[PDB]
Each structure stands twice: as C-alpha cells, then as structure tokens.
Curated annotation (Swiss-Prot):
This is Lysozyme C. Monomer. Substrate binds at residue 101. One of its GO terms (biological process) is killing of cells of another organism. InterPro entries: Glyco_hydro_22, Glyco_hydro_22_CS, Glyco_hydro_22_lys, Lysozyme-like_dom_sf. Lysozyme C is capable of both hydrolysis and transglycosylation; it also shows a slight esterase activity. It acts rapidly on both peptide-substituted and unsubstituted peptidoglycan, and slowly on chitin oligosaccharides. It catalyses: Hydrolysis of (1->4)-beta-linkages between N-acetylmuramic acid and N-acetyl-D-glucosamine residues in a peptidoglycan and between N-acetyl-D-glucosamine residues in chitodextrins. It comes from Gallus gallus (Chicken). It holds the Pfam family Lys. It is an enzyme of class 3 (hydrolase). PANTHER family: LYSOZYME C (PTHR11407:SF28). Lysozymes have primarily a bacteriolytic function; those in tissues and body fluids are associated with the monocyte-macrophage system and enhance the activity of immunoagents. Has bacteriolytic activity against M.luteus. The active site is at 35, 52. Keywords: Allergen, Antimicrobial, Bacteriolytic enzyme, Disulfide bond, Glycosidase, Hydrolase, Secreted, Signal.
Amino acid sequence: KVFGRCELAAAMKRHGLDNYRGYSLGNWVCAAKFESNFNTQATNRNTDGSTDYGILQINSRWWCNDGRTPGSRNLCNIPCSALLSSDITASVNCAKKIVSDGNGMNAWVAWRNRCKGTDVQAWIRGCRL
C-alpha cells in the first residue's frame, strides 16, 4: 500500500504513535517518509542476511522473522511479511518495542540523519487530526 503524507499521519494517530514515548507525530510521519516512501511493501536488504520491511523499515535480525536471516531472534514475535501489508498494525505495534527499548527513534538511521532536529510539525501541517 503508499500512504499519503496527511493520510499516514491520521492513521498513526488512529494507532497510539502520537507522543508516544514523547516522539511527536511528525517525528513518525517524516520518518516513516524518508525510510519507506509511504510505501508499506518496500523491502530493503543490508550485507548480513538481514533485511528491512514495511513503512517503518523494521529489521529481521531482532524484530520480525522472514525465514532467511539466521541471527534471528524474533523480538516482535511477528513474520516480516506481516510488516508489508496495507494495515500498519504490525509495524506500528512492533515500532512500539523499538522505540521503548533504549534508543529512541535513533534506532532509525534515517530520522536521525534527516528528521532529528528539523521542524517535523511541517509533515502534519494541513492535516485534520
């Protein structure tokens, strides 16, 4: 499924994101743009087996299992694939352990480089939320 910025935004609302662990919605929406492109299908393999699924690039060495990444410890106890379907439940409910485990949204190489410290509100602007 590609979400729309605005439509993304409400979505993730809809779901507990906003504030959650004290990230702003915005944090979440620019995050999830630059990581995924609004597109929940998008998959991403790095060099160590490992791959990266869904709007919010969860990896498969710790968060979800996908049947080819051997290091795997299947910390949100969900298969990869779940990740990519055109409802965020997953992800977001998966996202929720990554973002509370220690590192915040820094655990996301992209927020950090492109969203951390910018005015992430300008994501949500124009949104009915």
